[PDB]
Copies of this chain bind each other. A is one copy, B any other.
Amino acid sequence: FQGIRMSQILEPRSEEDWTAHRTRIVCTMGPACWNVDTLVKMIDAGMNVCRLNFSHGDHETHARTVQNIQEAMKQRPEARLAILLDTKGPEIRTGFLKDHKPITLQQGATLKIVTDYNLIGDETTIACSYGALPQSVKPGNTILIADGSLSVKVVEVGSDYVITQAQNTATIGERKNMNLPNVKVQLPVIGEKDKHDILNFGIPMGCNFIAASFVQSADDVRYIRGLLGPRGRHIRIIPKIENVEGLVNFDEILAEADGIMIARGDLGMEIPPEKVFLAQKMMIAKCNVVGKPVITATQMLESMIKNPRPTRAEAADVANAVLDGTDCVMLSGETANGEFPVITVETMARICYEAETCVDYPALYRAMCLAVISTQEAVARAAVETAECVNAAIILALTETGQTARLIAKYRPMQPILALSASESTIKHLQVIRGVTTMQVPSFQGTDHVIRNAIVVAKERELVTEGESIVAVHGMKEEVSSNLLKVLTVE
């Protein structure tokens, strides 16, 4: 920065400013936002996507939640919130402790971890739910227990047990989660429960995305796609990257997927903490280059579960994800179990807006040109260039499959993108794309007509004014092709 004055960043933003941020916001449903009234307030605040966390709840309880989303949307007929099912997936847990009493292990003390899950544990020996532990872990390996509370180094392996040594002093309760840094977990990513949730809830309840916890290989993604079948053709797959296997297989996972969710907090249980930030950056960049949405999740605004303001570090952490290039930022417990769900959504919208203040759009556009072509991409690229060249107020992306909108968004134009589509599922899928807002349009509508309608609607809503330039892009037969770019003036 030079010639730009410090007092500039100290202007308060108006509702009109921060609600027009480009980054998309994902909110986890829960008791704190159980009722229709707060869901509506969350829409106004910036909510674009509703996450159903299937680690808890059942088909009945999540049905009530869905019914409430549908009611909120009746009060806001212009909002087309997407619904994301987030699977439970594989889990490793410690077993039970004598008298349910927590145990404290001392640094350098010996802990046996056994495979018999009936074993009632004590300070010296505990049970682990993962039967293949002794055949997964080797001497020198690290095992984390209770959200990384306790760290043990593996000293010896038997057939049905492992001898470990505490790396720190800690107090652990019973049935705590376990992590196996640098070790593949030999458990199905999509178990029978997950399969039931995808097929018997996700499909008939109108979920638009599946976020699949703990994806370890691209075969996991191919598996969900075949599971989804023709009846689930309108559902997009968002693998969650949570360990080393996910990281090591990232490129093949990304290629098979419709987008990525980066679970930082889980990744920090599986690799040195000082490397998670590198991984995030790398994974966002790779998603960007290929034009697929990336969600940044976990450890976002966690203090707001209890406080009406986030910490400095938290605001910075969210802002840097935006600057890394993230499509979405995600709230978890802050909205599910928080004292300030709507205030948390407004706050993240504000942090997004301020980070987007930092974005160099010419240098992002040219960075994508040096990193990446087809007819569709060339025209999307020409559109962004031309929009900038003629000082256009907005870019119209006319789109059936979403491709056209995504290709333009990929180039991070300074101008807002209005994606126009007759397809309901496409409009929903687009709620996950930075820089895009959405308008559903009737079927069998001519190109010019659709463009005419969008501009006059925009002019009535005081988004564009008489005389400003507009850039419209029409991808035709998007994934089977012919591509248009029109420049027109608001009358």
Contacts and interface: CB of A to CB of B under 8 A. Distances in A.
A278 B312 contact: no
A469 B389 CA distance: 25
Interface string A428-470: 0000000000000000000000000000000000000000010
Contacts of A282: 1, 4-6, 9
Given A278-B8, A278-B357, A354-B278, A313 B313 contact: yes
Interface in A180-231: 182
A250 B371 contact: no
B286 A487 contact: no
A481 to B, nearest CB: 7
A309 B146 CA distance: 12
Contact of A9 (B1, B6, B275, B351): B275
In which size bucket is the chain A interface? 35 or more
A297 interface: no
A7 interface: yes
Contacts of A386: 378-379, 382
Contact of A286 (B1, B268, B381): B1
Given A9-B275, A389-B378, A485-B486, A317 B307 contact: no
Contacts of A317: 313, 316-317, 320
Contact of A277 (B267, B319, B484, B488): B319
A109 interface: no
A289 interface: yes
Contacts of A484: 484-487
A308 interface: yes
Nearest to A104: B306
A379 B487 contact: yes
Contact of A299 (B8, B313, B469): B313
A247 interface: yes
A314 B273 contact: yes
Contacts of A319: 274, 277-278
Contacts of A1: 281-282, 285-286, 289
Interface string A337-355: 0000000000100110011
B2 A371 contact: yes
A311 B244 CA distance: 17
Nearest to A484: B486
Interface string A250-286: 1100000000000011011001111111111111011
Interface string A32-71: 0000000000000000000000000000000000000000
Given A375-B489, A484-B485, A7 B247 contact: yes
A298 interface: yes
A163 B251 CA distance: 59
A19 interface: no
Nearest to A483: B487
A125 interface: no
A366 B284 CA distance: 24
A384 B252 CA distance: 35
A350 B271 CA distance: 13
Nearest to A279: B9
A315 interface: yes
Contact of A309 (B151, B182, B247, B378): B151
Given A10-B275, A277-B354, 16 more contacts: A1-B285, A6-B283, A9-B279, A272-B309, A273-B310, A273-B316, A278-B319, A280-B316, A299-B313, A313-B317, A316-B320, A375-B489, A378-B386, A382-B389, A481-B488, A483-B487
10 contacts: A1-B286, A9-B275, A167-B308, A268-B311, A274-B350, A277-B354, A281-B358, A375-B390, A481-B489, A483-B488
Shortest Cβ-Cβ A-B pairs, 7 listed: A268-B312, A273-B315, A277-B316, A482-B488, A6-B250, A274-B351, A274-B315
